[PDB]
From a paper:
FlcD, an HDO from the opportunistic pathogen Pseudomonas aeruginosa, catalyzes the excision of an oxime carbon in the biosynthesis of the copper-containing antibiotic fluopsin C. We show that FlcD is a dioxygenase that catalyzes a four-electron oxidation. FlcD is a homodimer in each structure. Each monomer contains two domains: an N-terminal superhelical linker domain (IPR037061) and a C-terminal iron-binding domain (IPR016084). In contrast to quintessential HDOs, our data indicate that FlcD employs a mononuclear iron cofactor to catalyze a four-electron oxidation.
Iron anomalous difference maps extracted from our native data revealed that in all cases each monomer contains a single iron situated in the middle of the three core helices (α1, α2, α3), which are surrounded by four auxiliary helices. In the FlcD·Fe structure, Fe is coordinated by three residues that are part of the conserved iron-binding motif in other HDOs—E181 (α1), H191 (α1), and H274 (α3)—and three water molecules to form an octahedral geometry. This coordination is reminiscent of the 2-His-1-Glu/Asp facial triad in non-heme iron α-ketoglutarate (α-KG)-dependent enzymes but exhibits meridional geometry. E244 is located on α2 and aligns with the fourth residue of the metal-binding motif of other HDOs and, instead of coordinating a second iron, is within hydrogen-bonding distance to two of the iron-coordinating water molecules. V278 and R281, which replace the terminal two residues of the conserved metal-binding motif in other HDOs, are part of a loop that disrupts the α3 helix. A second iron is absent and the α2 helix is unfolded near the active site. A flexible α3 helix was also reported for UndA, BesC, and SznF;11,12,16,24 however, assembly of the metallocofactor is sufficient for folding of the α3 helix in SznF,24 whereas α3 folding in FlcD requires binding of both mononuclear iron and substrate.
Numbering used by the authors:
A (entry chain A): 2 to 327
B (entry chain B): -1 to 247, 249 to 328
Write the structure that this text describes.
Amino acid sequence: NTRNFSLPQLQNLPIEEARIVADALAVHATSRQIDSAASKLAALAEAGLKGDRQAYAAYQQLLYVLSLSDDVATAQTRRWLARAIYRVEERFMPAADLSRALSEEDFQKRLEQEIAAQSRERHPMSQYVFSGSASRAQLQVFLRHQWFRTFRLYRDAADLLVNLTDVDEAAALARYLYGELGEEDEKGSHPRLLAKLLEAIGLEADFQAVSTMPEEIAYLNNRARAFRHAEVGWGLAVFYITELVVPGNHEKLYRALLQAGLSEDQAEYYKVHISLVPPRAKREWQLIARRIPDVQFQNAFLTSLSQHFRVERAYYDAIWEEMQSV
Amino acid sequence: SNMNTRNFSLPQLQNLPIEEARIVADALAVHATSRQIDSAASKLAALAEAGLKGDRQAYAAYQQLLYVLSLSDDVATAQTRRWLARAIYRVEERFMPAADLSRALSEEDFQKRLEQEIAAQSRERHPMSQYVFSGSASRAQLQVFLRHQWFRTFRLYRDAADLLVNLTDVDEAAALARYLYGELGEEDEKGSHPRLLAKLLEAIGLEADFQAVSTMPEEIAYLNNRARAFRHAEVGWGLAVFYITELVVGNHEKLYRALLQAGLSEDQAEYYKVHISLVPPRAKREWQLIARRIPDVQFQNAFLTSLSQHFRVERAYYDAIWEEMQSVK
Ligand SMILES: [Fe+2]
Ligand SMILES: [Fe+2]
C-alpha cells in the first residue's frame, strides 16, 4: 500500500539518478546529498530538453515521482528537488515575449482565439466518444485515463489556493475546492463520483494509481508545476482552461454513457460539470481581470496556457492511439 | 511602495538589526546559490539553538527571523523561506518536552488525557478573561484585546490550508475543505471570518489591516508555533492545533455576551456568534481524522507534544496581552 510512495517508485527505475534521489530523500540526508541530487536532476533535464531522448524520459519519470508521490514525510524535499527541474523546463519553453501588456479586450480575444484553435473538443477522439460510438473496451480506455486527470486535481487547485495571498481570492478557490470535494458529503466528491462511474463499467478506481503512459506523466507533471508556481498566472491559466471555460465535454459524454446503459446516478460525474455561463461572467474571472494590466502576469498566463495545450494535445493523441487499437 | 510591502520578507529583514538577517536576505535572492541557502540554514539553526539554550538575545532574534520566514506575504520567496524555516523547526522540536510514550494509549485513555489537559489549560478564570467578561474593560482596553484577536484570526485559514495540503486521503482533505469554506464565508466572501472580525474592529474604532505586522514577542511566538504545527509533515501536530482551535473552542459565547452588554449589536459582534457551538468534540465529523490515528503511537506522540507546546505559547501570549491591557486606561 506504498505503491505511489517515492522510494518504491524510485527502486523500480533502472537509472543512476534514481539512487541519487533516493539518497537525498533519506531521513538523515545531508545538505550535500540534496544539492547533488538537485544538480544532477537539473543537468538531466537540460540534456533531455536539448534532445537526449533517454535523458528526457528519465527526468520526466523522476519528476513524476518527486512531484506527485504521496509519502508526506519526503514532500518538502521532493518539491525542493522538483523546483530544480522546473527552472530548467521553464527556460526551454517558448515564452510569451510580450513587452507591453495587451488591453483587456485584446487579451480576451487572444485567449478565445487560442482556445478555439487548441480545444480538446475538436480532437477526433472527442467526436468519436461523444457520438456514442465507443465500444465498452474503448470507453474503458477513455475512463482509465480520465481517472488520472481527475482523481487528484483538487490537490493542484489547493496549491494555487495556498499561493493566493488575497483573502477574497483564496475564498474563490476555497469555493472551488468545496464543490470539488463534495460540499457537505465527501461521498459526492468529484473523484468519488468518477470512481463510481469506473466501478460501474468494470474498472478499479485506485487512489494510489501510478501512471505508466509517458504523455500522461508529462501532462500531470506540467499541471502540478503550473498550479504550484510562485507566479500565479501559471496556475490561473490552467485553472481557466480546466474549470472556467465552458466545459462542454461533460454534457455530451453524459448523454453517451446513459446511451451505453449506465444509470443516471452512475454517470453523475459528467452531469455535475455542465455549465452555460461564459468564462468572464464567472466570479473567478475577477482573479484574472485584476491582473491583466500587469505584463508579467500576462506573460506567465499566456506561456502557461500554450504549454498546457501542447502537453494536453500529445496526451489526447496518445489516448486516441490506445483507443483505436482495442 | 513601502506600505504595500511591509509584510514582505526583504523589508522586514532590513528592519531586523541581526547579523543573520543579511544572510537570510542573500539566501532569498532570485539567483541565490545552494551555498548561500545552506549557510543561512546553518546560521539560523545555530541561532535557534543558542536562544533555546538560554541566550535571550539569540532567542528573540531567531523568533523574529522565523516570523519573517514563515509568515511574510511575498510568494516569490515562499518556498525558500519555508525551506529555511524547517532548519529552525528541527532545532525547536529537539528542545520541546515531548511525549515519550512507548505504546499507544487506548481510545478512552487518550480522550481522558486530552480532556484533563484542556481543562487544566482553560483560561475561563484568567484575570483578563474575567476582566473583559465582567464588563470592567474600558473601550481602549477592549481595543487592546481586539487588536491582538486580529493577529490570531486574520490568517488562520492559511494555516488550515497547509494542513489540508498534507492530508493525502481525499475524504480528509474534504473535511478540511468544509472547514475552509465555512471559514472563508461560504458563498459570500464578505462574510469570511476575518472580514466578520474586521467589522467588529471597525465598530470599536480600529483598522483591520491584512498587511499587519506583529511587534509583540509572545504573539510572534504564538503565530510561529501555529504555522509550524499546521505545516508539519506529521499531521498529528496540525490535528492537535486544529482540534483545540476548532473542535473544542467554549469562549466565544461570553465574549459575545459581554460585547452585546457593552452596546454592540448582533451584526457588529457576529464574529463571536458564528463560533459558538453546542456539539462535543467527539460528536463532530472532523474527530474521525483523529479517531482513525489513535492506534498509532507515533501519531499520539506528535499530537500530545503539539497540544502541550500550543498551550505553553498560547498561555504566554494571553499573559502578554493582559500586561498590555493593564498598561492602558
Ligand atoms: Fe470538478
Ligand atoms: Fe472561524
